[PDB]
Amino acid sequence: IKQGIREVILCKDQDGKIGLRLKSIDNGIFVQLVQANSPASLVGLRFGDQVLQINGENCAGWSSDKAHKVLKQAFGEKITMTIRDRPFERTITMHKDSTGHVGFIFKNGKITSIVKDSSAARNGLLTEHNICEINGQNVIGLKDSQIADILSTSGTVVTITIMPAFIFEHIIKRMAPSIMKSLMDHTIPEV
């Protein structure tokens, strides 16, 4: 998770879609959903990203409705956004044991216990954090079984992007889990 602000320049698809849902948190605007194969995915927007500006308007104080309204009205030949990278998240690097474990239990995406003497304990993995990404792959919406598969079919070094449950809960609110399982970009990023 960069400590970095960055500009992205977007262009609507032939359907006038960018593939984004925004959500208002603590008088910021945060990315609730990046759609697979969208402009939003292509410029590299991620779950949990803060939108500081849209076309050089500050987003501070907007409803999620006003954020979505603004998007709709943009002469969207070209859309500029100032992004703060995933401010509510942190990345932890672990190494599997010979048993092939990093050493935690999760339920519905959320870490619930740390196993003693483990790489998770050594790196201070916290419980009551939801798992947002795994080796830069968004895994939000996926079943527990599929998350477990991605951890199985990884190298010895594992990278996990976590977010405090209470913050995760407040972001995803008013999004059908199915839509996030169905449409939340779970792809490895293009180059």
Residue ranges that bind ligand UQS, judged by CB under 6 A: 108-109, 130-131, 139-142, 172, 177, 180
Phi (first) and psi of residue 30, to 5 degrees: -120, 150
Residue nearest to ligand UQS (CB): 109
Shortest CB 138 distance to ligand UQS, Å = 9
In the complex with ligand UQS, the residue whose CB is nearer, 60 or 148, is: 148
Known binding residue 144? Answer is: yes
In the complex with ligand UQS, the residue whose CB is nearer, 39 or 141, is: 141
Shortest CB 168 distance to ligand UQS, Å = 7
Record the tokens describing residue 37, joined without a space. Answer: 């194969």
Distances, alpha carbon 170 to alpha carbons 7, 39, 79, 118, 120, in Å? 26, 25, 27, 31, 26
Shortest CB 90 distance to ligand UQS, Å = 15
Taking alpha carbons only, the member of 27, 72, 66, 23 closest to residue 48 is 23
Helices (H) and strands (E) in the chain, counts: 6, 12
Record the tokens describing residue 69, joined without a space. Answer: 């309204």
In the complex with ligand UQS, the residue whose CB is nearer, 43 or 183, is: 183
Binding-site annotation: residue ranges: 108, 143-144
